[PDB]
Amino acid sequence: LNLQGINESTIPKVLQYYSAATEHDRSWYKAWHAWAVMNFEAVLHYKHQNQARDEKKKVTEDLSKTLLMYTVPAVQGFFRSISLSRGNNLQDTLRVLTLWFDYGHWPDVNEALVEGVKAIQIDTWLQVIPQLIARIDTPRPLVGRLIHQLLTDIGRYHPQALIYPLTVASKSTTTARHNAANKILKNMCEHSNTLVQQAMMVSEELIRVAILWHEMWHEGLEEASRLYFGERNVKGMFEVLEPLHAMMERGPQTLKETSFNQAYGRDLMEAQEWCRKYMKSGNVKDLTQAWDLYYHVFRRISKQLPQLTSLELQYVSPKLLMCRDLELAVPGTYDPNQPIIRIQSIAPSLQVITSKQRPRKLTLMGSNGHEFVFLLKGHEDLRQDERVMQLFGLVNTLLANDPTSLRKNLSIQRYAVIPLSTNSGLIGWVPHCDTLHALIRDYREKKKILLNIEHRIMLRMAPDYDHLTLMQKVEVFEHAVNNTAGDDLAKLLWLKSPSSEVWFDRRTNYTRSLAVMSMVGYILGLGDRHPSNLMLDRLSGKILHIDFGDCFEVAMTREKFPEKIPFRLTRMLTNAMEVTGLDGNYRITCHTVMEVLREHKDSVMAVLEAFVYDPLLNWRLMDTNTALNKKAIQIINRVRDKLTGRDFSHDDTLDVPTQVELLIKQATSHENLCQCYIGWCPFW
Amino acid sequence: VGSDPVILATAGYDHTVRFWQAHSGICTRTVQHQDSQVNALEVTPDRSMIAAAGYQHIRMYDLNSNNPNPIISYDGVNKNIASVGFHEDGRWMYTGGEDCTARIWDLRSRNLQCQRIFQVNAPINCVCLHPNQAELIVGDQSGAIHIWDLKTDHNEQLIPEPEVSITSAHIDPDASYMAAVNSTGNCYVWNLTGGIGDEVTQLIPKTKIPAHTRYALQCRFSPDSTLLATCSADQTCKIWRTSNFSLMTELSIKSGNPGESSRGWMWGCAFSGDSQYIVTASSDNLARLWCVETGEIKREYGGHQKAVVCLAFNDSV
Amino acid sequence: STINLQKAWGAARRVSKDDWLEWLRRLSLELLKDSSSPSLRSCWALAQAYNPMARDLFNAAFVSCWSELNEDQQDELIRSIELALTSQDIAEVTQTLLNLAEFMEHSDKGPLPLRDDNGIVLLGERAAKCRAYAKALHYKELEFQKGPTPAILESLISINNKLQQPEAAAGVLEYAMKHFG
Ligand SMILES: Nc1ncnc2c1ncn2[C@@H]1O[C@H](COP(=O)(O)OP(=O)(O)NP(=O)(O)O)[C@@H](O)[C@H]1O
Ligand SMILES: [Mg+2]
Ligand SMILES: [Mg+2]
């Protein structure tokens, strides 16, 4: 393969060699793996070679016959490989799921799958049940039946590991999804002694406490006001107001809902009457009067929300306050090889955090007497974070198996991410981390150093910077940089250490942690990284990132203010390293990590491909660029280029140290830093 | 001021254009430009109007009137004006900058509708007009230089160093002479030739002239086609003799005490008289006059409070 | 308070190890006897008998005394410290003084004026003798920041090698091969 490559004249020879190797030693995992993969590659080869010309149905029949010749034994190969190993079978499982979803409707693939599934230990499917779920809507009854039977069998043995995502699935607005989920849950009610009802109770009360009526009416009226007075989109304005009134129509159930209704109901109902009068007569002045009423409601609400610092359960969710051992596992943990920690109690009150958005702190008591702290936050889709954490898990596994990375203790810190609905969920609390921004702010405050000296200097030199040309911005930037010593972090790392023997180790962990995340973030394509996204571990010195949103290069194409830097490497971060600069620990660590990532390319691609083609998440990228299938292909090709040394140019192949040096230069040049949005403070 | 060649014009971050006497230092008048900074200044062939390249606009002022109104201000562009040039008859004006187009106005019309515009796929750092011929030379941030035929829309693409952007160009009045500079320390000189054909050819490489000044920012030729001056972000300016491109002299504003060095960039220069004087701008907040034949100094103009970038003057009346 | 210096002056008479240990013990006790705070005075009777008790509070007592003594008294004390640091290779005394200097570096008073150059070179050498490699590295980087020399670069290579971090030494070598012959 290395000397000739893959073409119609080499495929059967390599397959013959792999088959012979398998026959010579039928117990050797690598022989079966290599054979299964080669057959998979042949399947893609013939499909690619035909579509490469047809797009740039006799051919379909030819493909069905040829691919079936390759595909059935490919499936058998992967099933055998899975059966011959444990723990490291993730890649093979994902490839089986890919072949199943794409080709399962063929009777011969179905037959192979049925025999395969019957022979596999049920526990090996647990690692893939955020992916089997949300494929239950597939319009291919054969596949549907397979999914439903498999999920039912899984629920029969490990219901604690399944009830969460099915409970979430049952709230879906798509008819087929909640119906299939309901059928599965109905079976679980018998198997799990109606544990399902307790899960639904907790899930619904937890969702309700996340968002209050005041917040919904505040944002609602703000947007509706923008539509009425700005865009003059009266239709859209009505569409925005409608669900708020429909929500209120159910009536209050809690003490907070009652107080809100008593305070604002009358005025809202009068506004309803004015809107109806407009609808009947067309008299926009009636809408103006309705907006005067809405204005008064909005204003009064805007006075009061800053005074909310905590919530007691007795006013928002008395059902949770009265609990009770619920026979549910603590949301953040489950291990089929260990005792299950049950939920014993819920803290009597929640603490509200004041910021642009307001998360709430929850504490649960478990059966082991330990406290578990979770951060509850709405208005965000957490499924992206879940998939990223799975990837990080894989990467940590790959690093753990390399002796070099065992001596150099490299790893990625991970979180617990638990979606509850399309717009809310729980994030695990990390008890000892401090945001980089806060550390610098507090340092400058203590020393009586103005927080914005560099900005003030830039404006004093040229008080029009935002509208200057590139070379003028470079001149002003370099001037301001040369007027102050950017080493606040280097001092903080030493002042906070109890001794030199601790400081030294903390600095070492800092440097290696940063290098690891620099290379992983590059391969992933992690976007906006600014002082409020990075955190330091107060005791170990390791670095965390907490906002895995724009995870692909869509974060290089925003309408305003790019996005030129592949990863953050500012002067203040470099100054915290050894006095010699980037050379040494940082560069060498980057080389080691890149070599490991290149060696195990296929596992990374299997996970990333599984993510990119997920129909419920891929839209997050579709809305930005292009036929989604074409953009998804371009994205995968870009990842392959990054992992094969052909990112900078397709006319050559670069070595590891060359690629790394090019990336460092790109990440440090002043020409790129001067173009960044001031919020992504380039001189910090 | 148009009637007296002694008056030199400067502009910078003070949002004003100042007119002062080259041989006395006396400030004579100011023009307000509060809307934005000025990227470039230029004087019409009619020696009675001055243009200023600002933010999202190009604005004309009367150099004779005592009421310097925006005579025919071309409100448009929407981003940046890299430079403004004029055709020799006073009929046409050329603009680079952003959006990535070379736009040409028919200056007598009061509308901004243009008779021609050339689409370029990187921002344009400079636009030059070929002497006595309806062709433009356009320097882009991509490192490419394009030549456009104003009569046919035919063109030529020159990419001598794709890795670096082009920062400035000026084609000598003598049709056989160069030049342009990039951001990495070297000037290129090619022979100018050509003929009849569809492609707007031909340049034939002659010599590479290093500066070793990390840039340059501006390339400019003397009226007698004898001297070539280069100005950079550094604190020096170099002058070569075009007869062989050997270095003739060097000007410098470096501090004598390193602790106070790098006071400002030498943002361009201009020749005055028959290769008699250099008028220089500096971001350190004054203009300076130098003699090319001897290095004799110094006259200064410090009417500004902020950095000074742009130069223009009534070299002939 | 002045008595604190009278014991310190013993660091131009002590010869044997026992003489220096007695010198340190006498200083430690005198720093407590006449302290400025009732929360420190009252342990003197205890420290007199509790041996480690004096040691554990030495730094705190010193800082209090430091804020009381004038420039001449501080000069005499600093000279006494310098003499103790150079007269003999006694680990207990050297380590105590090194810990004192480290503690003073984290205070609101600033480092001790162990002239010249705040004793950075001297403390560095002593740190090396005590095998306090982390301290030797810290002080070496502190003098590095004032301007590199080949001697400093070689010292950094030696210390980085003693700490079992070849990569840092490689970084230093690359620096040398970029800025020096
Ligand atoms: N595991 C965590 N541990 C401790 N604090 C966290 C953790 N995750 C987030 N935070 C902090 O709690 C707040 C998180 O709010 P959040 O809205 O999720 O972040 P964000 O910066 O606004 N990202 P986004 O809104 O998605 O663009 C911040 O004040 C964080 O400092
Ligand atoms: Mg937020
Ligand atoms: Mg959140």
Side-chain angles (χ1 to χ4, degrees), chain A residues 357 359 375-378 380 382 385 425 427 546:
Chain A
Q357 303 180 301
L375 187 66
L376 175 66
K377 182 68 185 70
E380 64 181 4
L382 298 179
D385 287 346
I427 301 296
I546 57 169

Side-chain angles (χ1 to χ4, degrees), chain B residues 55-71:
Chain B
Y55 179 68
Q56 303 182 310
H57 62 277
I58 300 171
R59 184 175 293 166
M60 306 296 108
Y61 300 97
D62 186 332
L63 291 173
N64 293 322
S65 176
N66 290 323
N67 296 284
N69 289 313
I71 293 167

Side-chain angles (χ1 to χ4, degrees), chain B residues 35-294:
Chain B
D35 289 346
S36 74
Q37 76 271 20
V38 178
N39 292 334
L41 296 171
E42 184 58 283
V43 177
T44 182
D46 291 334
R47 277 75 168 182
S48 54
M49 178 275 278
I50 185 166
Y55 179 68
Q56 303 182 310
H57 62 277
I58 300 171
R59 184 175 293 166
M60 306 296 108
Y61 300 97
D62 186 332
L63 291 173
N64 293 322
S65 176
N66 290 323
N67 296 284
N69 289 313
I71 293 167
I72 187 165
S73 184
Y74 295 100
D75 296 349
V77 176
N78 302 319
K79 291 176 181 171
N80 294 296
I81 299 92
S83 68
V84 177
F86 293 88
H87 187 281
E88 295 172 355
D89 293 335
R91 180 70 181 273
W92 309 92
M93 181 178 75
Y94 309 94
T95 296
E98 294 182 295
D99 282 344
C100 306
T101 63
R103 182 178 286 269
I104 305 92
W105 287 258
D106 182 342
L107 288 172
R108 292 177 182 176
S109 175
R110 289 283 176 175
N111 295 318
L112 275 76
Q113 177 68 56
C114 294
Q115 295 180 21
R116 54 173 65 76
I117 188 164
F118 304 112
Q119 184 71 59
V120 179
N121 63 337
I124 298 168
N125 286 339
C126 61
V127 180
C128 301
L129 177 67
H130 193 292
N132 299 305
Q133 186 166 330
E135 294 181 4
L136 301 179
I137 305 90
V138 180
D140 307 344
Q141 290 187 346
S142 68
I145 300 170
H146 292 91
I147 302 171
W148 297 94
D149 183 354
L150 293 171
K151 300 295 185 179
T152 66
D153 300 316
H154 293 191
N155 57 71
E156 181 179 40
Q157 183 177 80
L158 305 162
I159 313 177
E161 193 171 1
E163 298 84 12
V164 301
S165 63
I166 304 301
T167 59
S168 175
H170 181 211
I171 303 302
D172 191 276
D174 181 331
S176 67
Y177 284 83
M178 291 289 288
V181 296
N182 65 49
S183 68
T184 57
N186 295 272
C187 182
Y188 292 87
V189 178
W190 307 343
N191 291 310
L192 277 62
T193 188
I196 304 301
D198 292 347
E199 192 178 13
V200 185
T201 68
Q202 183 178 6
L203 305 178
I204 301 174
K206 179 175 179 175
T207 185
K208 182 176 177 178
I209 302 171
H212 300 291
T213 56
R214 292 178 282 162
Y215 288 90
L217 300 175
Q218 184 170 96
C219 180
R220 186 175 293 279
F221 286 81
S222 67
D224 65 1
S225 300
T226 301
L227 302 176
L228 167 62
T230 300
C231 299
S232 301
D234 210 325
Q235 298 166 92
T236 67
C237 175
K238 293 181 180 181
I239 300 174
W240 295 261
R241 291 163 297 197
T242 60
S243 67
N244 61 16
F245 291 105
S246 64
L247 186 67
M248 181 184 74
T249 191
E250 182 173 358
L251 292 66
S252 179
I253 59 170
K254 289 181 179 180
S255 175
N257 182 334
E260 298 183 359
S261 65
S262 299
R263 293 179 179 179
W265 292 11
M266 292 185 75
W267 286 96
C269 70
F271 287 92
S272 180
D274 191 22
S275 298
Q276 296 297 301
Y277 297 93
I278 304 297
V279 181
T280 62
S282 179
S283 72
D284 70 9
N285 195 27
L286 57 84
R288 299 187 173 93
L289 307 179
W290 301 66
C291 181
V292 300
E293 293 181 354
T294 62

Side-chain angles (χ1 to χ4, degrees), chain A residues 79 113 323 337 370 384 426 438 467 498-499 503 522 549 559 577 581 599 671:
Chain A
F79 280 134
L113 291 172
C323 295
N337 293 319
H370 294 195
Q384 182 69 61
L426 301 174
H467 302 295
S499 66
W503 164 82
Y522 175 74
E559 184 179 0
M577 298 179 184
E599 182 178 2
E671 291 179 353

